Structure 1
Amino acid sequence: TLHALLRDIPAPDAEAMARAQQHIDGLLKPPGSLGRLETLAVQLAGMPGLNGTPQVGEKAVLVMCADHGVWDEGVAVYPKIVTAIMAANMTRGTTGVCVLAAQAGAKVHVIDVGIDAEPIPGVVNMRVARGCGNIAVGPAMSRLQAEALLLEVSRYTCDLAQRGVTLFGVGEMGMANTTPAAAMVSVFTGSDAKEVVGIGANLPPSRIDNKVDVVRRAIAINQPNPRDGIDVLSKVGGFDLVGMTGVMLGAARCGLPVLLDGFLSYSAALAACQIAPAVRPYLIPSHFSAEKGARIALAHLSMEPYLHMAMRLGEGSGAALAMPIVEAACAMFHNMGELAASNIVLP
């Protein structure tokens, strides 16, 4: 069924997009003057899960939580248990993503794809293991484990669609997870680990050299194949990154838009688009994160985010922050008046 999911991602509706362009050109403004709001509306109009038009019903941010073996290499400043503490706080509404999702009218789904702690009540259990393998010394997981989790998360995602969610955001929580994110970005883009490794959650600058070394070691011991995104995810990714890629595949299969977040989400999007290029028209950037490897990842996705907030929290917080932008494109398209009704016509 993974083969089938990938094969059956629909093409966007080019004919609806052309009708959308013509409609937007007739709205009460100089043609082209709403810029990327116009192109965002046309992008939405082509998503087959919507109604031929930009549309926003219910909104969901899917936050993928897991721990990482590579935390053992000293690449993170916070204690391991913070992943579990933060997942529990997600159920209480006290995290950055919760507060911003609430403001945007979106629901947060907290998904445990492999936290190294006891199960947390209120969290969706999709737990592959208690943390993934330490990527510096071997693979994060087996190929079968990565494929199974991709299918489970894609299915959970498209079930939300059947329930009326029309806009997704993706996020994550996982101490040390900027390490595998950087390894994937290096592998997919061909960039040296040094160009894409940053401070993550306030790693002291003195410790960056060790982190670059770890990323290189992970890449060397595993030999991830850039032509096989599932190989890359399984080898030098993690459960959270696989789960994020699964939300993108699910939403695409369902013909629905998904907002990216920051660097972790850019790395998962590089995997998803290598796995299935048909995913790409469904992705919407939110913000340009303040993480070192952001520019390179975004360049490889040919993405220009809407928001420049110097944000680096993760969790889906930037995706939630951008939800009103998607709603604004819809509001423009459906609620603006038209040039012809005011008899405004130029030669």
Structure 2
Amino acid sequence: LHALLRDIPAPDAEAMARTQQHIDGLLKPPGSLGRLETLAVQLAGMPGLNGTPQVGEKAVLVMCADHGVWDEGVAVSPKIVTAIQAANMTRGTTGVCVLAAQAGAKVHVIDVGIDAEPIPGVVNMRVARGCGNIAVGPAMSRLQAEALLLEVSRYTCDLAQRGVTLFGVGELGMANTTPAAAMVSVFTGSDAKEVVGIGANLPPSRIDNKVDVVRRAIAINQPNPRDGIDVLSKVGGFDLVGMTGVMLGAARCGLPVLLDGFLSYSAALAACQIAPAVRPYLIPSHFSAEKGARIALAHLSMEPYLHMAMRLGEGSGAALAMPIVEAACAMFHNMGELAASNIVLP
């Protein structure tokens, strides 16, 4: 793991300078394609993309797990919905499946801790049947968190061998917006009230209890904000650890990863804390309608491309943004050049 983190490559400044020069000469006023230009240059710098913005195969990794904190009444969805939806992921009927299919991406469903019998068709990496209730103790041991990070990291970079060059990250886990809020509060130093949202339609009257649970989780566990693994193991969850793992693996592999919503922002804060070198590889997708989204994004210094008021999760936002990544590549490789049309601009 220390080796893993140590070997994450820095972005290639040489390929990026070459990319910038090429974009400036395309058939348009310099800088007019804005964030599409910046995105193309960002991609050119990722070593796994071989010096040029390009997209080969695409995969969305959905980390599934249950949470003991569900018993504190912080979620209205029945606990079994995690297991049921994970099965639906194998049938192609969920939101991320439909949006991934539209983008030509494949969905990998990974069970890292569902509290139910194993589901055929789902990748089995389960740590336990649900994590510990963070309101009274830790979600898991540090050892468990580190081992899951490594296993998911390896699985992720292995896909790079099969032609995958663009990843999307997602989750499935009833009650997971509670540990997500705890993590965001700890990493950003923001009060729980400012980052606890309604998740999957929690009634406005049940919010107070959710905020209290988050504060108790932090008070009892005393997670160290400077140690991302300490934070994940104490007030996180297996799904959150798994998402962080996809990010470290894509980075080690020198490839881009598209974030999704609030849960993924929590995982990204942990990933960047653990290894700042991961940052250049993350690409935001949409601006989640979850209350703590603005704060988490400000700490990651990220501005999403899509404002869709989405809050489903599952990696649906990440899938929705894949066409945008392909568009930056299309602009780069297919547009004509000013000089060829004899156009000279100041």
TM interval, short-chain normalised:
over 0.9
In structure 2, C-alpha distance between the alignment counterparts of 1:198 and 1:144, rounded to whole Å: 30
Q: Specify the alignment match of 1:179 in structure 2.
A: 178
Cα offset, 1:100, TM superposition: 0.1
In structure 1, C-alpha distance between the alignment counterparts of 2:57 and 2:334, rounded to whole Å: 19
Cα offset, 1:318, TM superposition: 0.1
Deviation per residue, 1:308-339 (Å, 9 max, x gap)? 00000000000000000000000000000000
Deviation per residue, 1:115-161 (Å, 9 max, x gap)? 00000000000000000000000000000000000000000000000
In structure 2, C-alpha distance between the alignment counterparts of 1:295 and 1:14, rounded to whole Å: 30
In structure 1, C-alpha distance between the alignment counterparts of 2:325 and 2:226, rounded to whole Å: 33
3-state DSSP class of the match of 2:314?
Answer: coil
In structure 2, C-alpha distance between the alignment counterparts of 1:143 and 1:220, rounded to whole Å: 18
Q: Specify the alignment match of 1:266 in structure 2.
A: 265
Deviation per residue, 1:207-263 (Å, 9 max, x gap)? 000000000000011000000000000000000000000000000000000000000
Deviation per residue, 1:43-69 (Å, 9 max, x gap)? 000000002010000000000000000
8 Å CA contact 2:156, 2:249 repeated in 1: yes
Q: Tell me how large the CA RMSD over aligned residues is.
A: 0.4
Deviation per residue, 1:259-302 (Å, 9 max, x gap)? 00000000000000000000000000000000000000000000
Cα offset, 1:346, TM superposition: 2.6
In structure 1, C-alpha distance between the alignment counterparts of 2:345 and 2:128, rounded to whole Å: 65
In structure 1, runs of 5+ residues without a counterpart are: none
Q: Specify the alignment match of 1:124 in structure 2.
A: 123
In structure 1, C-alpha distance between the alignment counterparts of 2:288 and 2:177, rounded to whole Å: 13
Cα offset, 1:73, TM superposition: 0.2
In structure 1, C-alpha distance between the alignment counterparts of 2:161 and 2:190, rounded to whole Å: 39
8 Å CA contact 2:112, 2:125 repeated in 1: yes
In structure 2, C-alpha distance between the alignment counterparts of 1:162 and 1:270, rounded to whole Å: 27
Cα offset, 1:345, TM superposition: 1.0
In structure 2, runs of 5+ residues without a counterpart are: none
Give the % identical residues.
Answer: 99
Cα offset, 1:162, TM superposition: 1.1
Cα offset, 1:114, TM superposition: 0.2
Q: Normalising by the residue count of structure 2, what TM-score does the alignment of the two structures yield?
A: 1.00
Moved over 6 A (4+): none
In structure 2, C-alpha distance between the alignment counterparts of 1:341 and 1:52, rounded to whole Å: 24
Counting matched residue pairs gives: 346
Q: Normalising by the residue count of structure 1, what TM-score does the alignment of the two structures yield?
A: 0.99
